[model samples]
Target: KKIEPFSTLVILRHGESLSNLNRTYSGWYDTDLTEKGIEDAYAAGRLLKSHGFHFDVCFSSYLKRSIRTMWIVLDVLDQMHIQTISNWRLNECHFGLLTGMNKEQICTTLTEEELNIWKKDTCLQPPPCAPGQENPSDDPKYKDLDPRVIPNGESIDMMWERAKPYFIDQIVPRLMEGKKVLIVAHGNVMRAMKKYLQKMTSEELMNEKVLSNGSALVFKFDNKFNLLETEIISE
Candidate 1:
């Protein structure tokens, strides 16, 4: 395989959504960007354009928020014509039974310790969905995937199954071919990508700094496709 010199990959997290303001677990639920989020997306796009950044291709989660963010960014960069692919593999971590539930409600309903464990524990399984619960497999966005592969909800490790391979097989190949690539995805999904790309352990990956909304991580790859350095850029 021919590796490009100084290949770059820009990984971005979508701007805040309405659910973010409500402090709800949004998961697969479709949530639109807040007004401020729209501005943030545009700002990120403008910043990238000002820096003369352009992408040869882009990828985004099937979720609306991520798709919308990518649209705005590409528009600002005048690269809306660039080939873009939407993949469910880039979706946010499924929150299972907690999806669409408010944070305060969860805390009021469950013990503080249990809530903490569910939110932050690296190894805990979130309470599974009730029988016949709506699952991603039933959703059009992921209907083509094997039912077992579609998340009813997932931990970071489980999420890696969907995210990591897509990075290695699809994104990395193009990136190594000298295409400047951009991925507009969710917070936790981005975290999973970082863990996979950097070869971090589960525990260490869990503690890695989270990406702020509309933030981008710029990575430079060597001719051998090894990540030489990464810098987080946030406005």
Candidate 2:
């Protein structure tokens, strides 16, 4: 195999979060990681190091699971001093009424028809959190972000709209400059990134779910910013 100079674009889904172990809908809920989740991140870092991977800058959502996962990966790589950005745009899809519910809860609680819409329709799912509590912007933690931009619970397409622009303007430019970039984020967010890179159609993207906890997708781009290859590193 030929050697690649840098991590052109590395997308790592965070280790299993508390919500994952609990079988809860974690979107925008700000949950922590389980002990296994922490170990998963550490093992992911070890796997990347074994493969001679190195990154200069990293990106993650403002959520702690992602941030801490990235931290562990960087620390293992001995690149903890590098620049890392935690942006709200990279956050997971806003699940609306399903935010904190488990799988059975979602099935038993929400209307079956709405769930069908949520599954089949990319942009038309309704927000079901509460009448006035549509979004998380009002929360003190996210008050720093622009209220006009925050989503009031979102569908897959809606979250992609926010994340895509960030990738185009912020991520692609850096990649063009030969920067190695890593993004530690959620399952849906990673799916969004892959969809962007592979140029998948909206309906087609639904076919590709993110890999399991601590799994990574690495995209290799040439000096011309042309994609050369994509590899999945799972642990």
Candidate 3:
């Protein structure tokens, strides 16, 4: 017998940021949304509204891009009063030396095969930040935590190891309690989440493209956490 879904989870990637427009690796170097990004976020919210969607709670990264996207979406839904959480665990995978670097210049040096490895190798990290370069740990937002926990760069696997606990401990409890949840985050972290929820194989994970800006994946689950349905809402 099909039981009614106990909770709904909407996972979204933040809208286009200035780094996205310039083809730079954004990582932990915070940037704000482009003008189009704001409009697209509004569109996504409108799409969700058309489906009669609402959220009991929302989560976002400390980055402004992710936070602003959540703000727009919540505004569109007229649900600004809902609780919102901002956590560093939801931050984008740190790009280290690659932060703010142009993708075109990077491609000029690395072969296509090497580039693919950077994209798909979960355990392989990018070049670490050099001495005198900006380090994410130096940011005030992370000052409370031990600096060792913060990395200048992280592989996808490394990110999941840190981020998965939050998803299981915090987000899952809300779902079990039948709270409608919204998570607006960065592209890489969302990929990590999708890989976990979908139980994707290495091949599948490699092939799975990052969720585009202002697009969202909607998931429904029973109280026991079994996935009941999945859909994409895009603008």
TM-score, every prediction = 0.88, 0.90, 0.94
Alpha-carbon error at 193 in model 1, in Å? 1.3
Clashes of 2: 0
**lDDT by residue (tens digit), candidate 3, 94-172:** 8888777898877875688887877666776878887888766577888897868887788888888889999999998
TM-score of 3: 0.94
Query: Given candidate 3, what's the lDDT at residue 121?
Result: 69
lDDT scores of the candidates, listed in order = 0.81, 0.82, 0.85
| Worst ten in a row by lDDT for model 2 | 131-140
Please identify which of the two predictions, 1 or 3, would achieve the higher TM-score against the true structure: 3
lDDT of 1 by residue, 115-142 (tens): 6665565555556676776654466766
Cα RMSDs of all predictions?
3.5, 2.3, 2.1
Deviation from native of the Cα of residue 153 in model 2, angstroms: 1.2
TM-score winner, 2 or 3: 3
RMSD of 2: 2.3
- Stretches of candidate 2 exceeding 4 Å from the true structure: 5-7, 109-117, 124-128, 131-136
- By lDDT, the candidates rank as 3, 2, 1
